[PDB]
DNA sequence: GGTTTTTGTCTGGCTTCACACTTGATTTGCATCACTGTG
DNA sequence: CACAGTGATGCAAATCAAGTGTGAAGCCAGACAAAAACC
């Protein structure tokens, strides 16, 4: 979700049309996103991101509120489908027992991963060519093997 | 079988607690509300 | 889909206070009378 914050922060300025930008433009995008977040979702800017911020910003209303700052309807649809895919994927690895708490999300995880992969490769070409983050690689590749090997993922987390 | 312990009873009579109703008049319990905090 | 708080508020539910005449239970008397675990 911190990387999604960065994605919104970069896309609010329409980087896909302007490949080059200055740190002043980056700070402008920072300020606009932070203001609109505090105005609509009642959040605050935080220096290093935490779990409560992650859960709040991984909501459909996050994109439903940030689309007002970007003009492109194609970008609106792309962000909406990206958020939908991530929210479908989250219960698989956050469930305390995915075999008896989200079988519908477990049965189509591979198809959702393929759709997310193709969307990242095509519609967000400006960031994910030759560089993909560790956590997206893990989430898109190794989750079904982990759930088949162990039985659950969220039970073995470090929140305790 | 003996021996000791462990429970059972006997009826008249005593105290002690629960209840039978009803109409309010409190007092107790538990869910709601949007949030933090360790990352 | 982290989970245990954080306190004020509000409504459902439990307890009760008033009245007297009952039932139901526990126990007192001293004595007689069956089960049961070791020889």
From Swiss-Prot:
According to UniProt, where does the site described as Essential for DNA hairpin formation, participates in base-stacking interactions near the cleavage site lie? 93
PTM summary from the entry reads:
Autoubiquitinated in the presence of CDC34/UBCH3.
Q: Where in the cell is it found?
A: Nucleus
In the UniProt annotation, what is the result of changing residue 135 to A/L/F?
Capable of nicking but defective for hairpinning
Found in which tissues? Answer: Maturing lymphoid cells and central nervous system.
Kindly indicate where the leader peptide sits in this chain: none
Domains as described in the record: The RING-type zinc finger mediates the E3 ubiquitin-protein ligase activity.
Instruction: Name the family.
Output: Belongs to the RAG1 family.
What is the name of this protein?
V(D)J recombination-activating protein 1
Species for this entry: Mus musculus
Question: Lineage from the top down?
Answer: Eukaryota, Metazoa, Chordata, Craniata, Vertebrata
């Amino acid at each position: 979700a911190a990387e999604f914050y960065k994605i919104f922060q970069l896309e609010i300025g329409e980087v896909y049309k302007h490949p080059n930008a200055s740190k002043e433009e980056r700070k402008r995008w920072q300020a606009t996103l932070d203001k609109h977040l505090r105005k609509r979702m009642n959040l605050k800017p935080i220096m290093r991101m935490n779990g409560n911020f992650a859960r709040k910003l991984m909501t459909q209303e996050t994109v439903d509120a940030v689309c007002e700052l970007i003009p492109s309807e194609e970008r609106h649809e792309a962000l909406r489908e990206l958020m939908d895919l991530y929210l479908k994927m989250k219960p698989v690895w956050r469930s305390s027992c995915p075999a008896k708490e989200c079988p519908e999300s477990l049965c189509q995880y591979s198809f959702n991963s393929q759709r997310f992969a193709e969307l990242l490769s095509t519609k967000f070409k400006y960031r994910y060519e030759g560089k993909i983050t560790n956590y997206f690689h893990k989430t898109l590749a190794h989750v079904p093997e982990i759930i088949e090997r162990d039985g659950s993922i969220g039970a073995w987390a470090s929140e305790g």
